[PDB]
Assembly symmetry: D2
Homo-oligomer: 387 residues x 4
């Protein structure tokens, strides 16, 4: 029951099941995994592919010979399993050199280094077949108001992304970029804090068509925002290139719980939206098995991630197909929301006495929207109290 | 000391000092104010101008006869005091007909009425000399996930704003639009919930140059966001058409405290940015004198808005003029942040061995950023523990 | 399926289904209900009883003759339906006289008036058979730091509750008090903001055994706190006299959604706790049908409140009875949490080399807690993906 | 200007200026500090004393031989500088053995070890002259609902603290305990999450007079609570045994900024309360110099903690001494709040017709509270826009 298959396109970062459990207040509770181990075990669970930071795969400061050895083992594991690498990213946050940022560090030499580190991993990503390159600017921001002129920092952020777009275009690489927003942590405030800010920023890049967003469930919820709404605006703008799935319990530190945990009803509405929009990208889990767990718990957590997606997919499909939900959607006038307000145009609207001079505002006010019946039908379907 | 003059461009909504004190749990504590008396009292306190919703000035339902008398009185009061009207807006949220929204109501006849109500007041705003027309879509949104398909709602929101742009251009009006974001309240989630979401949406309008943002301090802080950072991004994009100043204590109901209250250091950094950037628009206060106050308390709170801006302006100017602060900014490499990362171009960066192959990452990592010393100088200046 | 019966002890305030839809930004969307109407319609839906503020039932400023008439109609409705009145409360928040509080208003004459208004409604509550008297201090607090000396206000709050306890004891009334915490709204901060603060305060009253708490789901969640955890501490202290059930989407304005909405997994764990602890009080819904709804939506929302409790009760019972959940609870050592740490006493512990000198800290660290398997079993049961 | 002296009783944890900068996403940016060098550098800056976790002073695993050398060195450094040790505490959160808690671990052998580790350090704290022993149960809590039965966990927490009280009383030690609350991080939810929850729990201990709270500014603000109000309730209950001063920007990860940063007006009102109440305990800073800083930045940030306290103390004293402020407090009836509501007793209140039957509710409602004028005087004093 609810068995994932590679066709469900479930992917996992090496750093997810690989998280050793170090948090701001405690040491690691688990040994490091070999990336070859993670590839083989995820394949056995039904995953479609894996993702990585350069530093997950290639120890920082590896010689070129050592780099080749690390990639070759990972290679062979992918070939043996049929696992894909649909996305890759750069670690510009762990090493102390990035303590004030990568692309927006105040020091210019750090900013040049960050671009060279990124470009080097784009080459590797393309070699392994990645279609999407993710950027999470986790150190781009500030704790204090004077440390960062945000207009200058946005200039520097635009400069970095324009240069990366020039690089892939000149190389002829078939790869697109996705910006992963986060409002805060580890910096007091992070630049481009939400999906909305990242979408706005993309429109000022030199080749906007190369860039989209990689929203993460828990990050939008860390600002108290509605994640399905934000995904809808990304889809509306044609910019949902990738998605990070996990769980989060409201406004606090970034929990990265397994998908389904945290806000369960938001997860239901998210899956409803992704499936009915026909989103065809990877369903990527950016999550951390809690550090209370041993390795059996790590694999149980990863499996629960895909199981919960599949359960919610079934309930949302059953919800949309229910004849009673049907009628309720017509009763709440969802079909009328999808029709133009004024396809007759401005002059016709201005000359329409039914729209103002003769509009019965009190009769219109008295109409119930019947949203509560509709929502309890959705609740019933989520809980399996009807089919 | 710290006396406002109309050269300071402080403006106030009629609905601010006129708020009668009704909240979700209580009845009014103050009598309604005659719009003409508010104009005179604000002029006596040093204000530059006033703003209004249609329904603040003209009682809803007013005959075309009565409407004319109300405007004539108001225009006369303006002439007598001088007072400007730099901005106006539409009430699309109080009347029960708007309970599911104005521009994005599921019912099409409500959406057409909302547009007709807005266009009528655009004509009046232009007659009164308003340069900016604000839209706060307070009822656009949802309490439950199935009640609103957000892609269709954004289509309807775009349709509405495109029609408004066609109206003002066809009339030859020289007025611009400013979208006021808010994340929630009175709806469970409001569409376009932050500055970033509104900036992204503007780029998909037919004539984006006609539209900018009217951010409010307390609204971005209701999502835990850094209001000065969001202002900087609006300035960077060329879209800060107007601003709403008030105070808010973190993530809760929308408090609308007088400016200075709430988050005092964020207020300091906001004023630093506005004055440093040379923002020349109105300094508008969207605030509510607490309902504990009588009418003397109303005017004290309004005066406090302007006084707090003026104190912060002084401290931020002293901060930026301080030779010691200028040296601390250089020590933190803020001047290097204003440096192009790679004005030499992609190929030159790729060939620069000092940016990667020969970069001493450990020496760069050892550099302190000196941010804490800079921030304590900023604290000393704000508190007047130096000059 | 999932039909409520009076035996489920579901109760509703008159002000819940009676809410006319006025919010901080909009007028009422629904007409007032006659309390007789609400009693009869709730009985038909399967409710056990109703609750009321004095001002819900008796128009403020009613003469004693008018008061008698209003109670008699309500009376007869209760007799006709078999509906009980298990709890009553005082409105000390709506009238402008309470704008700085009731029990902790700065003005002493308001504080005396608030006590007299309260005592008068205790008499009526006892006459109608109420066992619990609730106090929600919604106006007790401040917007600014100097307006309220909190030590003096707590003295005044203790004084008020001590006098009420004296009154009921002298009268011989069989009634207990329950304090309903809320962190904020309509005041910027409210005194006794959480369950924990109210429990602490009760221990300083003259007769603590007379007082307990009435926690509300959405209020604890407005502080980002775990509601099941807070209920567990109230049960642990023997102080859970009453409970308010509803839904809330994280940290924002008080939504009062129907129970089940908001945080669905917290609702599951709350019902699990209440049922397995054998809580035998009323399951009271303090909720507001959204103002988008007509009266059909009002009754659908109220019905959904009880339906969702009954669904979650079934899933939590099935969860606890599942032999596989059994074994998983033993695997996570929940049974070991229930055993004393040191029933051998302090000296035996100090002399136990296995507890320190010879404790294998690394072997103990390596034990997985198996919490993720346990939690996915709970998820499966909630979603009906097993039985 | 604003120079600290040891008479100001500023203290610092070894782990504060010694924080190496490791966070969940990054490695250390600073080398470890020798405890002796921290003691000397803090003494040079004007500090009164230092505090420590067992594992800050003695490396975990140290032989009984090595342990003695470490304390001898530290004691000598204390003697040389003078420096006090007013408080000590146990690290029950870093080692992986504590991944499910110390006192409330599900595994009983871990709970016994946690107690033995604590008792060993209580002996050392007493040898060094500590008067307060702090417990922050950072790992007590849960990520998921089924992992912890909270009633059993509170039984185990009470058992632990009762054993500690029996130990110190049996030894004749003159040390008291202070529970440090935190709502979340590193656990999804932490038990006893706020000041109020901890105060309530203390009343159920065997010897409650031995236990109080050690509240931290940023921890109560992580739940959106008003830290000065929570301090007032602790003072009211006689339980403020110690305090942790730092800064926090609202509801997010625990920032531990230097005192003054974060919420500046809350800092002002806290200092006003502490000094007005005559709190004579340590002014302790639980802060982390941001990891952007080198060692010069570490000491600048530490100096900034003490400087900001001293500036606020000056402004709060000027505020309270101002005859104009004293008149504004009378105008807002703060002196009436200090009035018994009904010192004449229950019967007299019931017979007082002026308190109900003849109370003019409309006249009382018309009284303004003059809070905004009072609050602007407080703003002027904080900013030094008057003296
Ligand atoms: Mg992510
Ligand atoms: Mg506004
Ligand atoms: Mg309630
Ligand atoms: Mg602390
Ligand atoms: Mn995350
Ligand atoms: Mn607002
Ligand atoms: Mn509520
Ligand atoms: Mn902290």
């Amino acid at each position: 029951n609810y068995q994932p298959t590679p066709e469900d396109r479930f992917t996992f970062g090496l750093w997810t099941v690989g998280w050793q459990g170090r948090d701001p207040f405690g040491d690691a509770t688990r040994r490091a995994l070999d990336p070859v181990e993670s590839v083989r075990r995820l394949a056995e669970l039904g995953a479609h592919g894996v993702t990585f930071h350069d530093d997950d795969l290639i120890p920082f400061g590896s010689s070129d010979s050592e780099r080749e050895e690390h990639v070759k083992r990972f290679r062979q594991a992918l070939d043996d399993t049929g696992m894909k690498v649909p996305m890759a990213t750069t670690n510009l946050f762990t090493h102390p050199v990035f303590k004030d940022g990568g692309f927006t560090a105040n020091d210019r030499d750090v900013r040049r280094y960050a671009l060279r580190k990124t470009i080097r991993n784009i080459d590797l990503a393309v070699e392994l077949g990645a279609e999407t390159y993710v950027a999470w600017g986790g150190r781009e921001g500030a704790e204090s108001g004077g440390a960062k002129d945000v207009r200058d920092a946005l200039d520097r952020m635009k400069e970095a992304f324009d240069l990366l777009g020039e690089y892939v275009t000149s190389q002829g690489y078939d790869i697109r970029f996705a910006i992963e927003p986060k409002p805060n942590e580890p910096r007091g405030d992070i630049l481009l804090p939400t999906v909305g800010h990242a979408l706005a920023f993309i429109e000022r890049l030199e080749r906007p068509e190369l860039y989209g967003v990689n929203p993460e469930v828990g990050h939008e919820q860390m600002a108290g925002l509605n994640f399905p709404h934000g995904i809808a605006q990304a889809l509306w703008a044609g910019k949902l290139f990738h998605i990070d799935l996990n769980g989060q319990n409201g406004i606090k530190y970034d929990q990265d719980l397994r998908f389904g945990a945290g806000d369960l009803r938001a997860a239901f509405w998210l899956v409803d939206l992704l499936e009915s929009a026909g989103y065809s990208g990877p369903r990527h889990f950016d999550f951390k098995p809690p550090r209370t767990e041993d390795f059996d718990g790590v694999w149980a957590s990863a499996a629960g991630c895909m199981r919960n997606y599949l359960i919610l997919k079934e309930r949302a499909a059953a919800f949309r197909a229910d004849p009673e939900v049907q009628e309720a959607l017509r009763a709440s006038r969802l079909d009328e929301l999808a029709r133009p307000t004024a396809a007759d145009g401005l002059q016709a609207l201005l000359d329409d006495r039914s729209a103002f001079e003769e509009f019965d505002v009190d009769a219109a006010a008295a109409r119930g929207m019947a949203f509560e019946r509709l929502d309890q039908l959705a609740m019933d379907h989520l809980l399996g109290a009807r089919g």
